[PDB]
Structure 1
Amino acid sequence: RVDFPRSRLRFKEKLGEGQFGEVHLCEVDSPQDLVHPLLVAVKILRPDATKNARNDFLKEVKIMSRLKDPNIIRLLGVCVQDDPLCMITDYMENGDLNQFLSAHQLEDKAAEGAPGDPTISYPMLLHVAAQIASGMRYLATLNFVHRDLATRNCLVGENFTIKIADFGMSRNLYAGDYYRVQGRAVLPIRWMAWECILMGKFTTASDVWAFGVTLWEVLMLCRAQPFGQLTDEQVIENAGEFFRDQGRQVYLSRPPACPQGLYELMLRCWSRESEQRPPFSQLHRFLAEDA
């Protein structure tokens, strides 16, 4: 099945960089002809990319080809017949959600405002969170497990639209969010269900746990790291307390912006029993309909 026409991509700005690739903002004139212009993001494999990096790139494209939802990153096209390998996706103009919320302050306003405005309202936070829940609801229907849900992996577009993505665990900006040990998978422990930390297997139910923490982030306006006053080792030992179930495990505290009713739903996402955690359809309905 034919590549996207590589010649159509007019490169404008370099958005980001990794040791293997770089991401660019491109515009596409006359998107009408493709069966004023469209902005897209493209990830391109750098010419010095190892054999292993190329393989990972091709697998990433295949994985991404599964996912077709308004609130998940979308694979618009590819250029892989020739080099450099190219992956084309939605451009989300307001960047990653963690940096976005970090730059905002909470205000009680009836004005929807703009993503550029210095403040954001509580109803809008609920709307951000609902969109993530809706994305995750879709992934759950495919039994697709994300494994790294967090605000650093979400993107914000015009009019506060949200898309879930996955940028890997290697960005220096978020190094503090990962627990690294020689010979082991890198783990986002502060977002991980206890059974994930102890046994290393991920499920939709552990994605629900991570969503609870992602919700906590959003309601904190990303002002502080989950369990930020505790060390990595204490976070890992906390998973042990969940397993022993002697009532000594600890939870994230209620954000100021978070009403008690919503907090109680958040706490359910952190149920010891995976089966007692809310399904994403119920999480989505609560945020979309129940404030």
Structure 2
Amino acid sequence: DFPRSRLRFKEKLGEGQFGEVHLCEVDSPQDLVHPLLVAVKILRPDATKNARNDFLKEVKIMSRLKDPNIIRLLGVCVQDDPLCMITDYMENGDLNQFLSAHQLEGPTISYPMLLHVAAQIASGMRYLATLNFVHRDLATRNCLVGENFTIKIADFGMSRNLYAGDYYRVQGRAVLPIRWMAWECILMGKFTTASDVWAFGVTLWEVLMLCRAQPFGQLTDEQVIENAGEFFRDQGRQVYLSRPPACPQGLYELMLRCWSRESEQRPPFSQLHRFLAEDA
């Protein structure tokens, strides 16, 4: 596994129950593939067996995820306690905070740069599909920003209090990000690659809004659940996210295709990348 002796503390990026996150420095990297900045999630020596089990299930998943636009697992420290996972560290935080702090061309962001960010997301989602892996929680909050506008798709679960509003419970049953979920996810619980395309659609709406508003921000969580019912009903009472001001009708009709009632009609990520890379 990874030598703990090679991890040099810099900052405590945060804490929670059963663990805490650290930013560390690694000299002369001859373990991975001038010191390298790494992100370390460490399990508390007080953590429950349920907490230990969840950590090793998460390590198992991440170990297969190897793509330039997906968060890499550099290593683990599982042989002894406390258990830890080492990922790449993305200096500019998540895409939501990154976009929220910028204005369109407080630094600026250009329309081609917005599309370039949305292109990395599609190319990344394309990879997970080739592995037949459903993300289940794609949104800007779950996208990390690095040097030279690089985007790497991550998943924080429901660990950050900042995004508590993006999740609807449903107890007790299942805490869900309904505002990003397709109609079939809400009514049936049928998560697929085709429903990830719907989430991608909503994510591209977020990017073109520059993370300024929450999807269906004027409607209640119950009203959004009601709206999934109208897509199944197909009588013309179904509603959609409005066109962002800085969005041409062209790119808007793309978002609309991610919102086709039939999952077969929704375009795949290979097609979504190619359009975001060619048409502007």
TM-score (norm 1): 0.94
How many residues matched?
279
d(CA) in 2 for partners of 1:289, 1:25? 38
| Cα gap change, 1:33 to 1:169, in 2 (>3 Å) | closer
CA-to-aligned-CA distance 1:26-80 (integer Å, 9 cap, x gap) = 1101114657211111111122211111110000000001100000011011110
d(CA) in 2 for partners of 1:20, 1:285? 42
| Cα gap change, 1:80 to 1:216, in 2 (>3 Å) | same
d(CA) in 2 for partners of 1:83, 1:37? 25
Contact 2:258 2:267 in 1 (8 A): yes
| Cα gap change, 1:35 to 1:70, in 2 (>3 Å) | closer
| Cα gap change, 1:258 to 1:10, in 2 (>3 Å) | same
d(CA) in 2 for partners of 1:89, 1:8? 14
d(CA) in 2 for partners of 1:11, 1:244? 55
Q: Could you tell which deviates more after superposition, 48-57 or 232-241?
A: 48-57
Q: How far off is 1:19 after superposition?
A: 1.6
d(CA) in 1 for partners of 2:155, 2:134? 12
Corresponding residue SS for 2:99: helix
d(CA) in 1 for partners of 2:253, 2:15? 40
Q: How far off is 1:5 after superposition?
A: 1.2
Corresponding residue SS for 2:67: coil
Contact 2:139 2:200 in 1 (8 A): yes
CA-to-aligned-CA distance 1:78-119 (integer Å, 9 cap, x gap) = 11000111100101000011111000000xxxxxxxxxx611
| Cα gap change, 1:252 to 1:168, in 2 (>3 Å) | same
TM-score (norm 2): 0.97
| Cα gap change, 1:185 to 1:119, in 2 (>3 Å) | same
Q: 2:242 aligns with which of 253, 258, 271?
A: 253
Q: Percent identity?
A: 100
Contact 2:19 2:41 in 1 (8 A): yes
Contact 2:26 2:36 in 1 (8 A): yes
Q: How far off is 1:185 after superposition?
A: 1.3
Q: How far off is 1:183 after superposition?
A: 2.3
Q: Which segments of structure 1 move beyond 3 Å, counting only runs of 4 or more?
A: 32-35
Q: Root-mean-square deviation (CA), in Å? A: 1.1
Q: Which residue of 2 aligns with 1:77?
A: 75
Q: Could you tell which deviates more after superposition, 44-53 or 204-213?
A: 44-53
Q: How far off is 1:223 after superposition?
A: 0.1
d(CA) in 2 for partners of 1:18, 1:138? 31
Corresponding residue SS for 2:264: helix
Q: How far off is 1:136 after superposition?
A: 0.2
Q: Which runs of 5+ in 2 are unaligned?
A: none
Contact 2:2 2:31 in 1 (8 A): no
| Cα gap change, 1:33 to 1:246, in 2 (>3 Å) | closer
Corresponding residue SS for 1:30: coil
Q: Which residue of 2 aligns with 1:97?
A: 95
Q: Which runs of 5+ in 1 are unaligned?
A: 107-116
| Cα gap change, 1:32 to 1:81, in 2 (>3 Å) | closer
d(CA) in 2 for partners of 1:221, 1:35? 34
Q: How far off is 1:248 after superposition?
A: 1.0
Q: Does 1:24 align with 2:13?
A: no
Q: Could you tell which deviates more after superposition, 32-41 or 59-68?
A: 32-41
Q: Which residue of 2 aligns with 1:146?
A: 135
